[PDB]
Amino acid sequence: ARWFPKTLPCDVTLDVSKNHVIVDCTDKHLTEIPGGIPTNTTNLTLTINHIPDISPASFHRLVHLVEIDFRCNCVPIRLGSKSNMCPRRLQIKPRSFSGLTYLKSLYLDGNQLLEIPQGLPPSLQLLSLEANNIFSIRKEQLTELANIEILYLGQNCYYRNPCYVSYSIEKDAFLNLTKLKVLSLKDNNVTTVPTVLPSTLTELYLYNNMIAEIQEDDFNNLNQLQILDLSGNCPRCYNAPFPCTPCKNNSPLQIPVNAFDALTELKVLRLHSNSLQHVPPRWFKNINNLQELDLSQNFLAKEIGDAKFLHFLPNLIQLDLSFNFELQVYRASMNLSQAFSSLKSLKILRIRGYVFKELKSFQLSPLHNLQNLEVLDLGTNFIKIANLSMFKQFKRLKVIDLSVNKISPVLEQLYYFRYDKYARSCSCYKYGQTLDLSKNSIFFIKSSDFQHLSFLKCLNLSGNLISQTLNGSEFQPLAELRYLDFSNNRLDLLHSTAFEELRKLEVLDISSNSHYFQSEGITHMLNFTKNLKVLQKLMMNDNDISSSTSRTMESESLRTLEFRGNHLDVLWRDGDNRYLQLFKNLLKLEELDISKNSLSFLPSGVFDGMPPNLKNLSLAKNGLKSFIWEKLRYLKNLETLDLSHNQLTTVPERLSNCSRSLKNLILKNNQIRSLTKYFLQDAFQLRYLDLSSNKIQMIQKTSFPENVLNNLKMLLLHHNRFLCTCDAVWFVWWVQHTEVTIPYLATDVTCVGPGAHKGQSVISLDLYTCEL
Amino acid sequence: ARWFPKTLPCDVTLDVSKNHVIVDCTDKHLTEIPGGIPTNTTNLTLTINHIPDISPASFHRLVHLVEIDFRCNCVPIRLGSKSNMCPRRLQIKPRSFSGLTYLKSLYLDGNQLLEIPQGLPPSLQLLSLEANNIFSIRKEQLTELANIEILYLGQNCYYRNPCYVSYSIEKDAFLNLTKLKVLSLKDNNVTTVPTVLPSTLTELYLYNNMIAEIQEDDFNNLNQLQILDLSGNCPRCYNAPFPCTPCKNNSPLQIPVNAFDALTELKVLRLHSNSLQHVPPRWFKNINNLQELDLSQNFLAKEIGDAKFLHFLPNLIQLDLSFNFELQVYRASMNLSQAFSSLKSLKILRIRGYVFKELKSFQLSPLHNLQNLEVLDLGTNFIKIANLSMFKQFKRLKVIDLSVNKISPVLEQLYYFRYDKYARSCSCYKYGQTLDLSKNSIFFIKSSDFQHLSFLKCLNLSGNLISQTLNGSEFQPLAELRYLDFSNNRLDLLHSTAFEELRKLEVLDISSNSHYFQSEGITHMLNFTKNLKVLQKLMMNDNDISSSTSRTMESESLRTLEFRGNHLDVLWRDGDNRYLQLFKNLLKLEELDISKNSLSFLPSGVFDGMPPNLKNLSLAKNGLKSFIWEKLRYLKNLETLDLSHNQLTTVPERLSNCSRSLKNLILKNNQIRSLTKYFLQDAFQLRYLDLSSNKIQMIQKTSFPENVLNNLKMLLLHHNRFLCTCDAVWFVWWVQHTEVTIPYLATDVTCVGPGAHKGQSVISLDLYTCEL
Ligand SMILES: CCC[C@@H](CCO)Nc1nc(N)nc2cnn(Cc3ccc(CNC4CCOCC4)cc3OC)c12
Numbered sequence A, B: 001a002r003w004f005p006k007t008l009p010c011d012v013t014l015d016v017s018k019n020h021v022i023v024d025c026t027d028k029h030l031t032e033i034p035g036g037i038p039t040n041t042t043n044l045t046l047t048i049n050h051i052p053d054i055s056p057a058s059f060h061r062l063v064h065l066v067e068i069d070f071r072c073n074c075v076p077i078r079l080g081s082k083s084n085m086c087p088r089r090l091q092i093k094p095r096s097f098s099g100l101t102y103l104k105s106l107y108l109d110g111n112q113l114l115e116i117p118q119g120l121p122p123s124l125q126l127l128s129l130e131a132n133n134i135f136s137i138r139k140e141q142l143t144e145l146a147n148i149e150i151l152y153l154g155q156n157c158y159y160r161n162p163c164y165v166s167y168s169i170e171k172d173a174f175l176n177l178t179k180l181k182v183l184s185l186k187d188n189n190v191t192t193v194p195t196v197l198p199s200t201l202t203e204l205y206l207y208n209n210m211i212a213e214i215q216e217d218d219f220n221n222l223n224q225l226q227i228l229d230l231s232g233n234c235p236r237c238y239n240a241p242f243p244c245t246p247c248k249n250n251s252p253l254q255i256p257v258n259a260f261d262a263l264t265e266l267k268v269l270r271l272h273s274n275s276l277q278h279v280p281p282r283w284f285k286n287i288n289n290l291q292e293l294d295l296s297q298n299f300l301a302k303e304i305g306d307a308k309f310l311h312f313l314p315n316l317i318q319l320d321l322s323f324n325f326e327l328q329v330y331r332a333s334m335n336l337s338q339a340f341s342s343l344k345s346l347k348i349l350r351i352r353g354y355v356f357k358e359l360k361s362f363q364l365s366p367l368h369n370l371q372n373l374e375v376l377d378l379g380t381n382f383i384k385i386a387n388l389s390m391f392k393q394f395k396r397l398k399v400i401d402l403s404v405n406k407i408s409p410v411l412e413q414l415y416y417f418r419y420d421k422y423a424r425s426c427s428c429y430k431y432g433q434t435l436d437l438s439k440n441s442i443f444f445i446k447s448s449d450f451q452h453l454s455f456l457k458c459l460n461l462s463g464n465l466i467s468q469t470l471n472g473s474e475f476q477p478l479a480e481l482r483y484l485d486f487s488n489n490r491l492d493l494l495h496s497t498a499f500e501e502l503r504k505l506e507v508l509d510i511s512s513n514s515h516y517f518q519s520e521g522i523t524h525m526l527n528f529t530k531n532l533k534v535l536q537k538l539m540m541n542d543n544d545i546s547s548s549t550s551r552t553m554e555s556e557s558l559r560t561l562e563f564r565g566n567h568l569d570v571l572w573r574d575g576d577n578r579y580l581q582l583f584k585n586l587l588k589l590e591e592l593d594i595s596k597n598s599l600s601f602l603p604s605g606v607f608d609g610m611p612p613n614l615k616n617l618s619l620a621k622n623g624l625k626s627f628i629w630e631k632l633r634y635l636k637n638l639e640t641l642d643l644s645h646n647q648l649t650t651v652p653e654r655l656s657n658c659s660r661s662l663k664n665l666i667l668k669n670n671q672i673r674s675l676t677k678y679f680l681q682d683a684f685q686l687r688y689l690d691l692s693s694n695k696i697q698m699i700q701k702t703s704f705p706e707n708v709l710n711n712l713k714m715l716l717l718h719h720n721r722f723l724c725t726c727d728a729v730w731f732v733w734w735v736q737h738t739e740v741t742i743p744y745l746a747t748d749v750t751c752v753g754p755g756a757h758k759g760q761s762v763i764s765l766d767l768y769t770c771e772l
């Protein structure tokens, strides 16, 4: 046990490897810099707090600092919290940083700062001033920043943080910063490319601005430049989910043909949402090392059919030409240029939102000999007609995405339509070849549909209109298939011979296929699992299963079954003993999720009819009012038990008398008010205990023995109704001097009383009066 | 040992017998009321602090308070500290006390208060407002104080705290205080007796004021009155050591003959310094229960010879008639009235400063039959001639004081001449009959001087001019004598037969008789102790003894010897081995004080030549630079060792190996910088350790075993040079969590560094950084 309790409301970590003393005070509702931070502290984080000022006294002793993270302490109105708004901007007093000799990184994002903090140490390499109110950069301001390498000045003038004027940058403002490597000026209302920039630059971000034209001499000296982003300058504002204003007369970002002549070392060129109509081949005359080219959200639908520029990119790896569609035009077919065959290196190709009625083998002919091609993304294209057998010339490919289409007989939810994807805050693919057909209109399936696709390892048929009775003669060609996602469909389990043709299948997802289970008298064959000789994981979540024609599910291979969101309460209706041995015959089963099954009580015989090798069992979100803990004696292999979000008021008299196997117990979000006299007594196998978010008042030494407690990896106690009287004298002392990992010890492990101590942390408590 | 360290800078005590939670913060340099005082607190003391205000928030939780001691927090300029002066008077905000339902006592003395604190609880019994600036009492102000029993309003307008006006009291101001028992108005510039006072009063103090006359009806209703003080009204200002102003024309305090007619229950009447010339017998017509009458500092020298009033006082116990002398008259003899014989009850009689040349048996004749008489004080009388054989008619008497006179062949230093002896802040007699002849002019003594005084048990001849060679034939009659104080004389130890005639003597004090020891070649016989067969204690302090004709002191009875302030360094001069066994032959000796003997080093053989039963040994204030601890193996009965105020730098490697008996070790005010690796290891007999006022930086677990430390009754560590680094991690934790009585833990047990911790108490320290 500890000699001195850790009273500091910050997570202190030690990294002797790099001699870093990391102090983390992220979102600890601070109003002052916490007193008593180690002198040997190097990395200090104070994000999402309410510290109103930074005076020299702030970092006084800690002269060993190398990083200061003072982000979002006064986050702008439109970007930050409306319940707890910032009253006055962060006040940085002079000589606050100049003393910190060893400082290398300084983050001051979202603090409503009016100017570049002067008096900074010459050791600084990184300076972040994002989301502040600095929209006038002058040469005098950056004189102190001589040694800076990475500079973030972005988000200082945009729709979420306006300045109502254009961004101003002095002539040759960044020119004397002879060590500058990274420069971000994103989301700033910048009208023209700041010049002259230092030749030492390698990354340049000028996206989401007022730049309407590029000069030929704009990047004449940036020979060392590797990444350049000129996106959101003359944007394609159609269906934009953010205030978007395009260049007058819908004009594109005017770039001279010889503008990228100096950028020999350029690898990434992002030209997303620039209203571009033509891509001149002359652009890439001297860039033979380009690997990533983002040409999404432009008007290059006609240019895709020509694309003479592709001949100058034989080293290109990534090509994004998404949402280049001409509105009012619903194309019959996709015109792909024969030039796409000259992309000898290309691994990733993305052509979403081209918009066309029909997909044919002939259309994809220029890609037929692209040896390195791994990904083909043709999603959100409204393709009505497509013959899947055409992808036999694409066996080498890892992912063939056709998600969100209208075919009938991993990137984020918002990727191409978000203002800034790289904005800062405060999956079956592994199995092999994947064909994504999710969110389509396939209403009926047959063996002939998957002809020649024997090679597939994963197939996604989620969100289709398959309202069929499968007899195991629908996916006959897919012999190699290991994963099938059949979620969000209308599966009809009339036959127990369903899915049996997929003889190599390891993962089956039949979740959210509730339609037929939601109607009375319909035959449901859940014993279909028996024929799947290699099935490892099965998901039948949110299916509303209240009836079953088969009394048992059979399997000699299955290890994981997700049965969350069904009606086991109806299958297990007290008096009805027919479905109590339902999961008993899934012999190799180790994991069983029977959460969200409306089980207010578990009928006697559920524990006896459990598979022999069950390890992890969840009964979470069931509204369980009563539980017979003693019955866990049947679950002889049990290690984990999730009983979170229930109505349980009492723990067992002796946990060791219930299970000798049980390691991790979860009892969070219940109604427990008091633990039993000798609860955890003699339960030496226990390694994890969550008792957080309950109504517990007192915890005694008998209920929580030290020999049992000191072997726990983590003990969760936060959000309880703790009474800090003289009877809680053991608990207060134990919690303070323990080595056991108690999370939120200085934010949610607090007293509800008596009076004097109401709303005070138990860690800060001093019950010396109980000792006089 | 403790679970929660006591961090509060106040001495917290618990007396479950009276249910009092006593919190004492006397002189703890406080500027705010210390946070975290027990809620169960009843008695709270905050004297000699710098708390500038009292707001309702002050005693918020502690509603169980019965006593509040908020004295001297703003003590007036002339009365308080000049280095740390009070800037602005104590500010008592409204409703600060009204909430404290159970409050009984409230002390607000010396806070420069301008008015009576309003809004006080109706439960209050005692209110103290001494040394404030309240010199105008109005009826409206005391309406809240309905239930008050004891009231202190004194020292609000005197020479140390002026108000430059007369004290004002409304007509019938205290009349409605129907429960008032005590009322002090001392040192207040009061011109007339406040009337009408409540009949319920028992104690009245009106001393040191401007009262020139008493009215007959002034005490007409105070039938219950027990004590009345009217002193310092028309004072005797001759030789006054304070600004004294007497009544015009040196007039006495005019008291009507019938003024004390209502005071039947009066027991104490103090009329000190009232310039009185005649005491009318009519005063005591109805007071037959009076026991204490103070008539000192008046002009009753002629009245002492008449004293017709003494016939009305046959129940009187104490009679003080000191300093009544007439300036310009050095009387031939003391004229005592034959009326003194009517004082059948009198135990104490004091007649100092009558000023007379000669004392004779005949003069004291009225006291010859006073059966109860115990004390006769005839000091500071300038008596030139007196025959001590006259006190044979005073064998019954306990004390016959003749101290400070000019005879030649317990009260304080300032008692009769101090402004206020009862002012508030922020001895052989036990042996039997005593004759005090100290501070006289006796130059020669003989057996005939003490003729008939065989009965005496204690004789004080301190501070006389006895420059004699005693041969043991000077005090032959004093056979019963058990104590002789012969200090401050010029004893000449030419004969070893000195003092031998006092065959029943237990205590002899020959201290400060340095005269002859301060001159070379003179014979000194210290072996004179041998003939005193019952001597228990001997004091020969500050005698400057550097030589002795006798090499050894012999005694079979002596148990205590004080040899402080001599020159043992010269007697024990390295090379001179003659006086090393000096104290060896005092066999029954248990205590030996050899402090202040200029012993920078102890010569080898001093320990071997020590009496066999020595228990307590002081070597304090010697300037001891080096000590051979191992040599304590000779002192086989030693329990206490005082080595305070020396130049010692090191402790022994193992204290347990130096003595087997040592219980209490004192090492305060030394130069110790570090303790030995296993200092207190196995020292099971140790119970007291004073390591205070040294230069110790660190203390380790090995030096202070937990097994030895618990046996310690008290451990003194304060005023040391403690370094609060990570090496002091054990010491900081031990001190915080120990039950061992460590005094000044929150005022002098503090860090000298490193930087961050400089001037911080070790009890408040949190070295959690040393644990990460
Ligand atoms: C009203 C609900 C009754 C159950 C009874 C199934 O024994 N029917 C059905 N349940 C489900 N889940 N889906 C469908 C879809 N069509 N049908 C009707 C149906 C189909 C086939 C057969 C069985 N025919 C076989 C019998 C053996 O020789 C070969 C033909 C009988 C049917 O209804 C009685 C369904």
Ligand SMILES: CCC[C@@H](CCO)Nc1nc(N)nc2cnn(Cc3ccc(CNC4CCOCC4)cc3OC)c12
Binding pocket: B469, B492, B493, B494, B516, B521, B522, B523, B524
């Ligand atoms: C110069 C210092 C020498 C010492 C020597 C003492 O053996 N004398 C004296 N020391 C002290 N402390 N005080 C006095 C006061 N008078 N005398 C002189 C004195 C007195 C008596 C005797 C001894 N007479 C006794 C001896 C025994 O048969 C009967 C006569 C001798 C003296 O000086 C030599 C003193």
Ligand SMILES: *[C@@H]1O[C@H](CO)[C@@H](O[C@@H]2O[C@H](CO)[C@@H](O)[C@H](O)[C@H]2NC(C)=O)[C@H](O)[C@H]1NC(C)=O
Binding pocket: A020, A022, A043, A066, A067, A104, A105, A125, A126
């Ligand atoms: C502590 O702060 C340092 C300096 O700010 C961080 O160092 C960076 O570490 C990454 C690798 O983790 C490197 O790629 C960067 O180049 C380093 N930056 C500098 C300026 O040296 C470090 O990661 C921080 N550690 C934690 C846990 O916050």
Ligand SMILES: *[C@@H]1O[C@H](CO)[C@@H](O[C@@H]2O[C@H](CO)[C@@H](O)[C@H](O)[C@H]2NC(C)=O)[C@H](O)[C@H]1NC(C)=O
Binding pocket: A157, A158, A159, A161, A162, A163, A164, A165, A166, A167, A189
């Ligand atoms: C970007 O800069 C333009 C100016 O170039 C800002 O537009 C002005 O806004 C004010 C207040 O809304 C108007 O009164 C002016 O007429 C506008 N001028 C022009 C030329 O349009 C614009 O507000 C800035 N953007 C942001 C987000 O602050």
Ligand SMILES: *[C@@H]1O[C@H](CO)[C@@H](O[C@@H]2O[C@H](CO)[C@@H](O)[C@H](O)[C@H]2NC(C)=O)[C@H](O)[C@H]1NC(C)=O
Binding pocket: B157, B158, B159, B161, B162, B163, B164, B165, B166, B167, B189
């Ligand atoms: C006691 O009251 C008297 C008033 O009766 C004060 O005496 C006055 O003092 C002021 C200032 O020292 C003088 O201007 C007056 O002339 C004084 N008057 C008289 C009649 O003495 C006296 O100062 C008060 N005593 C104290 C201790 O404050």
Ligand SMILES: *[C@@H]1O[C@H](CO)[C@@H](O)[C@H](O)[C@H]1NC(C)=O
Binding pocket: A302, A303, A304, A305, A306, A335
């Ligand atoms: C593709 O588009 C180009 C124009 O961009 C056109 O000349 C060509 O004929 C088209 N090819 C096909 C097969 O549609």
Ligand SMILES: *[C@@H]1O[C@H](CO)[C@@H](O)[C@H](O)[C@H]1NC(C)=O
Binding pocket: A387, A389, A390, A452
């Ligand atoms: C789909 O293409 C394959 C050849 O890849 C062909 O055998 C099959 O008949 C086609 N399907 C239809 C419905 O035309």
Ligand SMILES: *[C@@H]1O[C@H](CO)[C@@H](O)[C@H](O)[C@H]1NC(C)=O
Binding pocket: A403, A427, A428, A438, A439, A460, A462, A463, A485
């Ligand atoms: C199948 O596609 C859907 C999107 O329609 C997605 O939610 C799911 O995660 C995909 N399946 C796999 C195995 O990743």
Ligand SMILES: *[C@@H]1O[C@H](CO)[C@@H](O)[C@H](O)[C@H]1NC(C)=O
Binding pocket: A471, A473
């Ligand atoms: C399965 O159903 C198909 C029609 O979907 C039918 O042609 C086939 O004969 C059926 N096979 C069996 C074994 O039921």
Ligand SMILES: *[C@@H]1O[C@H](CO)[C@@H](O)[C@H](O)[C@H]1NC(C)=O
Binding pocket: A496, A497, A525, A527, A528, A530, A531, A549, A550, A551, A554
């Ligand atoms: C499934 O369920 C019933 C028996 O309960 C039976 O009709 C059917 O043939 C069983 N099939 C398998 C695969 O066990």
Ligand SMILES: *[C@@H]1O[C@H](CO)[C@@H](O)[C@H](O)[C@H]1NC(C)=O
Binding pocket: B020, B022, B042, B043, B066, B067, B104, B105
């Ligand atoms: C505590 O306060 C009460 C009331 O004033 C008093 O009678 C008692 O003697 C006090 N005791 C101490 C130790 O202060």
Ligand SMILES: *[C@@H]1O[C@H](CO)[C@@H](O)[C@H](O)[C@H]1NC(C)=O
Binding pocket: B302, B303, B304, B305, B306, B335
């Ligand atoms: C004592 O004094 C009184 C006067 O006070 C006087 O009458 C009397 O004779 C004196 N007696 C003696 C003995 O001095």
Ligand SMILES: *[C@@H]1O[C@H](CO)[C@@H](O)[C@H](O)[C@H]1NC(C)=O
Binding pocket: B361, B387, B389, B390
């Ligand atoms: C002292 O008084 C006594 C009687 O008390 C007497 O015998 C003796 O002679 C007196 N002595 C002197 C020196 O006056």
Ligand SMILES: *[C@@H]1O[C@H](CO)[C@@H](O)[C@H](O)[C@H]1NC(C)=O
Binding pocket: B403, B427, B428, B438, B439, B460, B461, B462, B463, B485
């Ligand atoms: C003897 O009188 C003196 C005062 O002259 C005093 O210091 C000493 O304490 C008295 N002796 C005793 C035994 O009290």
Ligand SMILES: *[C@@H]1O[C@H](CO)[C@@H](O)[C@H](O)[C@H]1NC(C)=O
Binding pocket: B471, B473
């Ligand atoms: C003691 O001293 C006295 C006084 O000086 C003297 O009369 C007597 O003879 C001395 N006796 C001896 C034996 O010294």
Ligand SMILES: *[C@@H]1O[C@H](CO)[C@@H](O)[C@H](O)[C@H]1NC(C)=O
Binding pocket: B496, B497, B525, B527, B528, B530, B531, B549, B550, B551, B554
């Ligand atoms: C004191 O010692 C001296 C010699 O040192 C001797 O003459 C004298 O008689 C001794 N007295 C006693 C009482 O021992």
Ligand SMILES: *[C@@H]1O[C@H](CO)[C@@H](O)[C@H](O)[C@H]1NC(C)=O
Binding pocket: B633, B656, B657, B658, B659, B660
């Ligand atoms: C001191 O220690 C030594 C060695 O440990 C031992 O021989 C000796 O007797 C000890 N002496 C005492 C007084 O304890």
